[PDB]
């Protein structure tokens, strides 16, 4: 529980890049999608940048 979620930035991740699902924003911590934030269609349907944009409105 002490790494930032790559989407919402809150400290919810235990092992980074190991597909944990953030309980705040729902982002699955996929390392392909954090290494390429415009890549949609990995563990998450949206890209990381799409998910951050949506979450920051929420």
């Amino acid at each position: 529980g002490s790494y930032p979620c790559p989407c919402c930035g809150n400290k919810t991740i235990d092992e980074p890049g190991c597909y944990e699902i953030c309980p705040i924003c729902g982002w699955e911590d996929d390392p392909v999608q954090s290494a390429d934030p415009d890549f949609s269609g990995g563990a998450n349907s949206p890209s990381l940048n799409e998910a951050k944009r949506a979450f920051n409105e929420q």
């Binding site: 235990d14 092992e15 190991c18 597909y19 944990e20 699902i21 309980p23 729902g26 699955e28 390392p31 392909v32 390429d36 890549f39 949609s40 269609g41 990995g42 563990a43 349907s45």
Partner: protein
């Protein structure tokens, strides 16, 4: 390390629609374990720096990963298919 029952239920909520042959999170986790223990022909594998193993079968489009002790991390069907695999 994330609590395993919550990890399994969270992944089933997120990815269950991709596996309509399964009805509950236990069947989903069983299937992920079975996939990585008895990988069907054509299942490709990679190792990550922390000892996790990754699995991907292009025929079924099923990706899964487990830690060095066999505890599953995730199982899903990437929309990008093999392109997702070739990115790692």
């Amino acid at each position: 390390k994330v609590e395993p029952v919550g990890n399994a239920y969270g992944h089933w909520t997120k990815h269950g629609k991709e596996f309509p042959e399964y009805q509950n999170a236990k069947q989903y986790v069983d299937a992920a374990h079975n996939f990585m223990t008895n990988p069907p022909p054509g299942t490709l594998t990679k190792t990550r720096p922390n000892g996790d193993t990754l699995y991907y079968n292009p025929v079924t489009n099923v990706f899964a990963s487990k830690d060095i002790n066999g505890v599953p991390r995730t199982m899903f069907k990437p929309e990008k298919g093999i392109e997702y695999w070739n990115k790692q």
